[PDB]
């Protein structure tokens with residue numbers, strides 16, 4: 015049929031005219047097929063004969079259906095879609111199974127010939143005009159226009175889902191207990207009723223839809239879970255991902271590692287512990303898709319654990335609105351974080367992992383906070399409320415980091431949970447100068463045209479070194495000079511730098527970086543017992559600064 | 572509300588199209604609050620559902636009045652206000668009295684509900700489309716557009732300007748020394764009267780409003796008085812600038828003086844006249860940071876004279892009505908926050924502070940949102956425009972929590988910066 019529902023008014027983008035593409039010559043076979051197809055559509059209202067100078071035209075084709083059983087009419091709307099107004103998005107998101115409440119019965123029904131069952135705004139039909147050519151373009155040709163939603167048109171998905179929402183409203187109101195989800199052609203219907211009263215209510219729905227131009231399956235329902243939707247396997251009782259299977263082959267091409275990494279990332283939302291760090295490292299560097307990549311030891315091991323984790327099936331439970339959400343985060347290898355979300359201890363609703371670097375220079379406390387934000391945001395989308403956290407960090411450690419960090423930091427209600435590795439700061443810069451500690455006035459200059467710079471220091475105890483460097487930035491010499499002061503230094507040391515750049519990095523207590531130097535400066539800082547860092551303006555003849563500035567700048571600087 | 576009227580025709584700034592801003596995910600309780608509210612506004616014809624043919628979107632949120640268990644709808648019209656600037660800024664701009672900032676008291680009254688009396692040009696309604704999202708994307712999500720003037724759009728005060736003049740007229744004529752100013756949704760009323768007489772004149776002004784259907788209980792509905800005094804009153808004439816402070820210790824270590832020389836050096840690119848030449852004192856050579864040091868005579872003078880310049884209006888800086896106002900906030904610790912307002916870096920038009928003040932809560936985001944409202948409010952009083960904020964926080968953490976503590980009906984521009992180790996130099 016053609017739903018009696020009102021139509022959605024539509025226009026063409028501002029200051030544009032309908033499409034007018036020439037119809038390319040078609041062979042006899044393709045022509046006869048198109049006629050046989052259009053004629054049929056013409057009998058059901060889908061299309062109508064036109065003619066009288068409808069300047070508009072869209073090219074058509076016809077191709078052999080699967081296995082080559084029947085022809086299919088292909089309408090290339092590229093030109094029209096461009097001249098068509100923009101619409102609201104059909105979906106700005108996708109339900110996550112874990113956010114689904116537990117239901118007793120669930121069946122899915124697909125609307126047959128969806129688009130063709132919905133009228134097209136009369137004032138727009140004139141633009142969907144196309145023509146069936148006559149043999150070797152001798153005579154005119156048959157001309158039609160659409161009366162319903164065309165297959166490849168820009169507005170079919172939007173208008174259809176919106177038409178369906180209106181058609182479904184009345185039924186929903188009279189059935190608060192029935193849950194309905196629209197996904198393209200499909201309509202998902204669930205409830206906590208009995209398979210008997212459920213199928214009763216189902217039929218009642220088919221009828222409601224039929225009174226509206228929409229036909230649905232009889233007992234071809236395709237219902238009866240498990241359902242396979244968007245890579246998931248939904249049961250009324252639980253959920254998991256489609257079955258994952260790892261290749262197990264001798265050599266691996268880039269293409270194979272990518273498919274593998276994709277599968278693992280997908281599995282990581284219910285299967286805890288999944289790691290792809292070592293596997294992802296191998297894809298680094300522009301490599302051809304067919305290139306074989308030797309697996310390294312780590313990779314082997316990582317792939318190994320993953321196979322282990324995947325052997326026994328795991329499922330996720332559904333959401334109970336009456337209980338709290340508990341999220342627990344564990345620290346895996348450096349930078350790698352994993353988490354589980356449940357309501358009743360260990361019956362996971364969802365799983366996940368966070369690794370994202372987020373700028374060079376960072377520390378477990380900042381990463382843990384970032385992981386907490388991802389999870390917080392995610393929870394709001396899926397369940398509409400934040401979870402209570404369980405983190406591997408002492409209330410004290412957290413308290414001392416938040417209170418002294420320049421950035422504003424909050425964190426939802428949490429509790430400590432002793433699950434090594436625990437998170438901690440690996441060193442603390444002193445707030446005041448260390449008395450009876452050698453002071454190092456470090457500095458560093460560098461020639462821009464040459465690149466040869468000298469890094470060095472001068473102490474109040476008379477000591478003074480100055481090593482040269484090749485191919486270094488003014489910034490590196492400053493990071494190099496601090497590195498020195500820490501090396502030839504005792505457990506306690508006062509360092510005076512004139513480099514704000516260095517001050518910023520070090521001052522944030524980073525326990526990992528991308529600069530090769532910064533990682534070494536971190537090792538030193540850890541071995542110390544007291545380190546005091548202070549800053550002064552460069553080139554202002556400050557006491558000690560100029561002293562070093564001299565035997566550092568001398569010779570290109 | 573008030574009778575119809577030829578809808579003032581509006582138009583976007585050509586070369587620009589309506590807003591298409593994504594809706595930030597909301598918590599269940601806020602979503603519910605919103606459908607109730609929107610269901611009522613619908614029954615009253617304020618808004619109407621719309622179809623997919625409308626490609627526009629402006630985000631919406633829900634805040635609490637003044638802890639009042641009554642939710643309020645907040646629409647983020649920042650984008651729309653930007654593509655409509657021509658309209659409300661030049662075409663129908665509203666003047667800003669310079670006297671307001673000098674008043675002893677300024678009471679802020681919410682007059683937003685008044686906008687729902689007037690209808691919006693039908694050809695402009697499509698641009699005000701917003702969307703009520705749903706949990707876990709389980710359903711399409713209710714879409715709407717306004718039929719009357721919306722509350723967070725700068726177009727609304729502009730248009731209503733005509734009515735507001737008729738309404739206040741009798742009150743203005745009878746009280747020539749009371750300053751009234753309108754800034755999108757709110758009315759700023761100021762007088763040099765004594766608190767008792769002021770509060771009394773505000774009551775009188777509400778009676779006038781009331782006759783045009785503008786019941787305006789202020790301070791954002793006071794249903795539970797914690798420290799609530801009256802109806803939300805500001806005291807501008809007592810807003811003082813925050814100077815750049817120089818220590819006054821009894822002992823000066825090499826470190827203490829090095830730090831002193833640093834803050835001063837920086838304070839040279841701002842506050843012309845500052846000098847520290849006679850101050851590079853004993854920091855000549857290579858002494859231990861510890862080693863305490865005496866004090867020169869030139870120094871005492873240096874220090875003394877510099878702090879005179881600082882703690883004063885940076886000679887040469889003037890507000891430029893055309894350029895945007897920028898506000899920067901630094902986290903000082905212990906519930907302390909410093910901020911500066913300027914148009915051109917380090918050329919402060921104003922600096923200040925904000926503290927827990929024997930209250931507030933251990934949430935940084937909490938304090939920070941409170942600081943932003945305080946600063947934006949002062950900015951509206953003094954200049955008539957809001958500043959763009961450089962917030963020292965993670966975009967995600969902010970976007971997730973700000974509405975949780977927000978109470979104003981406007982939203983300022985904000986970008987997330989990363990604070991340099993300047994801090995030590997408060998300003």
Ligand SMILES: C[C@H](Sc1nc(N)cc(Cl)n1)c1cc2ccoc2cn1
Nearest residue numbers: 109115116117193195202204248250
């Ligand atoms: C209407 C049903 S409610 C439902 N509840 C369960 N416990 C299990 C299943 Cl299978 N369905 C539904 C199905 C889907 C599929 C994707 O997103 C959806 C949103 N809602």
